[PDB]
C-alpha cells in the first residue's frame, strides 16, 4: 500500500487532493499536514498532490501482503508492543476473559 | 425535600386561604350590615 510521502522541496502529500503539483490549501483542525496552535486557527499551507511523479523525495510504503521471501531489515527482528491495554474492557477482550 | 416543602406550603396556603375566606365573609357580612345600617 502506497501511503504517500514528501515532495523534493519537502512539502508532504495530501490524502485525496487529486493533483500531481503543489496546491495552497486552507487547512483546519482534523486535517493532514497541519497542526493548529490557537483553538480555531486555520492557516494556508503548501501540500503536494497524491498522483506520484518523478518529482518526489521519499514515498511512504506499507507492505500489506506477506510474500514468499524473508527480507533482512523488515521481517527478521520483531519488536514487542511497548504498552499493553489499560481500559478493563480492552484487557477483557485481549485475554478472552469472561464477565464474572 | 420537594414532597415535604409542597405539603408544608399546602398547609400554610390552606391556613391563609381560611384567613382570606374569613376576611371575604367579614366584608360580605359588612354588605349584610350595610343593608342592616
Amino acid at each position: 500500500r502506497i501511503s504517500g510521502g514528501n515532495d523534493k522541496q519537502g512539502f508532504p502529500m495530501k490524502q485525496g487532493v487529486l493533483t500531481h503539483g503543489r496546491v495552497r490549501l486552507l487547512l483546519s483542525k482534523g486535517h493532514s499536514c497541519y497542526r493548529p496552535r490557537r483553538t480555531g486557527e486555520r492557516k494556508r499551507k503548501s501540500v503536494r498532490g497524491c498522483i506520484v511523479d518523478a518529482n518526489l523525495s521519499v514515498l511512504n510504503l506499507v507492505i500489506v501482503k506477506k510474500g514468499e521471501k524473508d527480507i533482512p531489515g523488515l521481517t527478521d527482528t520483531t519488536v514487542p508492543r511497548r504498552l499493553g491495554p489499560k481500559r478493563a474492557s480492552r484487557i477483557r477482550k485481549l485475554f478472552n476473559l469472561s464477565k464474572e | 425535600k420537594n414532597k415535604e416543602e409542597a405539603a408544608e406550603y399546602a398547609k400554610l396556603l390552606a391556613k391563609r386561604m381560611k384567613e382570606a375566606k374569613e376576611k371575604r365573609q367579614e366584608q360580605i357580612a359588612k354588605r349584610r350590615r350595610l343593608s342592616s345600617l
Partner: protein, 262 residues
Amino acid sequence: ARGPKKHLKRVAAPKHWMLDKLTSVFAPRPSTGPHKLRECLPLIIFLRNKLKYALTGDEVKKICMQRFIKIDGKVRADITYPAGFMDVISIDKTGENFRLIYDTKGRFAVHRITPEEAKYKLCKVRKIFVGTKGIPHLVTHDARTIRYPDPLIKMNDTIQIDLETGKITDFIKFDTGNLCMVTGGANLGRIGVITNRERHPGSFDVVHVKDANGNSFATRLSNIFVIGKGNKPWISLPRGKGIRLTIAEERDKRLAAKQSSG
C-alpha cells in the same frame, strides 16, 4: 472593550471601601456574586483594611484558603468574594461574628454580634414570580431564590432567614411606621420610621422616612430596607444608631470626648 472587564482601577473603586491612592494602580475587582460591584465589600478589604489581621493580599490568601472565613453560613476561599449588606462574616478560630450593616457615614462599619444573633440574617425581597408548576419563587437582594414562601410576602418586604437551613422564620411587610435602614444615595446608613411612600407611576416611587431625633428626610424606594416592626429592630444596630449627627455636632462631640476622656 470587546468583552467583559477583569480589572478595577484604585481611583475608579467605590468610595466607601476607603482605599488610598498611593499603594497600587489597581483595587480588588469583586468576584461576580450576590451583591453589586458598587454596593459589596470584598473579603480582602474586610480582612487587611478593616480588621487588619493580614497586611498584604497574599496574607488574605493564607487566611481564606485555610477555610476559616464563613460568610453568611458557608466557607469562602475567594479573597475578592462580594460580602454585602446584612451578610454575617464568621471567623471561627477567634470566635468572632460580624454583620455588614452600613455606618451612618456611607462606609460599612465593623459590627461584632453574638453567635446566637449570627444564626439568622434579614433579606429584602426584590421580586416574586410563579415557577414552572404554580410554585411561587422569591428573589432577595442577595439573590437567595426561595421556593414556597408565605403567600402574604409581597415585593418590597424583608424576611428573617436562618443561615444553617436557608428557610424564612418571620417577614416584615413594607408598611408606614416600620424602621428603615437606607441602603443607597446620600442618606446611606440612615435609620428611621417610614412615614409616606409616594407613588409615581412609570417613574421611581420616593419614600419619606422620619428619623429617631425627628430630622425627617426622603429616598427613592429602591434604596430602602426595613430592619424592624415599628420602632424595635430585628438586628443589633451599630453605635450612632443610623442618625447622622451633623458636622457641627460631630465637631463638638469630638471636642467633648477628646477633653472628657483625656
